[PDB]
Design a protein around this ligand. Structure first.
Ligand code: NA
Ligand SMILES: [Zn+2]
Length: 348
């Protein structure tokens, strides 16, 4: 019970591109943010707040490896006003924005501390395949996109496994395999627990000249019965099943969850279907398939107009058996070997 409090939760997401501080509360917060020096500090003042257990716990959320925050102290500064003080490891350009309650979160105040390669993309948030035959004239450029991150945990298992962790571990195994393919070059939209907006993932792939885009997930249905792996490609004109339409809806809410402030396209979909099929065939040796064909729905991460893009449901984490499989090194590796083998079989 937290009806009485103003601030109800406080989270810090340390990452190399930016550290995010989130303060969640029952009413929209009036705040002021400013800087101090000797030592470099960022200070946030919050109004209509009484200090409590939650804000007092803010100091113990600061990890010894936050690239931005050396430490955080909090006090009542005024009978109305809490002051948060962040001692810094490097110069920052803070950006603060407020979010209305949505997706199960109450009011959120977000502060992102940026420094004063993916930085370039987040800060201008206000190309495509190179010429030649990928694989033969130059390497195939693959962009891996592990779903979610930071504030957005993704779907959560019955036994508490978070989709964000497992799709990252699976992306890392797959990255590691690819960097033994002489044929191949790999980038990642993220390689840590950070939140990346949906359009930034897409833009990263256009920016780094991807030949293939794979988005990796472990989503959830309300029922714990549906299980197995599955592969999706884009449709802008209607989903091929209610399951696919639903996952498009849940996956597109990511930007709300984590929090932020057309002749050539049909041809790209056709290639994506063909690449999706190759990948499905390899997942079918390794796992139950949820559906036996490649499906389509309005997935925002698959909107890159010039790049074949697919979304791989490694498995539905809503399912108890598949939650447990997703935690295992063997099954994560089988999934990684399957995507790779599918990539190779597409180029032949
Ligand atoms: Na390589
Ligand atoms: Zn997901």
């Amino acid at each position: 019970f937290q009806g009485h409090m103003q601030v109800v939760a406080v989270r810090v997401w340390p990452a190399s591109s930016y550290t995010r501080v989130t303060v969640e509360s029952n009413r929209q917060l009036k705040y002021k943010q400013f800087a101090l020096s000797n030592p470099e500090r960022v200070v946030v003042d919050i109004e209509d707040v009484n200090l409590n257990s939650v804000l007092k716990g803010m100091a113990a959320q600061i990890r010894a490896d936050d690239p931005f925050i050396k430490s955080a102290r909090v006090g009542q500064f005024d009978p109305q006003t809490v002051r948060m003080v962040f001692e810094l490891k490097q110069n920052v350009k803070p950006q603060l924005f407020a979010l209305a309650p949505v997706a199960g979160f109450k009011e959120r105040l977000v502060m992102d501390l940026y420094p004063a390669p993916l930085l370039a993309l987040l800060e201008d948030y206000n190309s495509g395949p190179q010429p030649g035959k990928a694989g033969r004239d130059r390497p195939i450029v693959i962009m891996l996109d592990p779903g979610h991150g930071g504030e957005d945990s993704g779907a959560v298992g019955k036994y508490k496994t978070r989709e964000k962790d497992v799709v990252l571990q699976i992306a890392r195994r797959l990255r590691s395999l690819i960097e033994k393919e002489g044929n191949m070059k790999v980038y990642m939209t993220r390689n840590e627990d950070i939140f990346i907006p949906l359009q930034v993932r897409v833009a990263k792939a256009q920016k780094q000249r991807a030949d293939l885009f794979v988005s990796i997930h472990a989503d959830a249905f309300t029922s714990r019965q549906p299980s197995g792996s599955s592969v999706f490609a884009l449709s802008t004109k209607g989903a091929t099943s209610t399951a696919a339409k639903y996952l498009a809806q849940t996956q597109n809410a990511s930007d709300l969850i984590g929090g932020v402030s057309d002749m050539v396209q049909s041809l790209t979909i056709a290639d994506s279907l063909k690449f999706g099929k190759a990948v499905l065939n390899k997942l079918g040796k390794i796992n139950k398939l949820h559906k036996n064909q490649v499906e389509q729905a309005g997935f925002a991460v698959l909107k890159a107009p010039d790049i074949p893009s697919i979304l791989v449901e490694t498995a539905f984490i809503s399912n108890v058996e598949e939650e447990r499989k997703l935690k295992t090194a063997t099954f994560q590796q089988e999934v990684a070997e399957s995507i790779l083998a599918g990539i190779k079989a597409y180029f032949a």
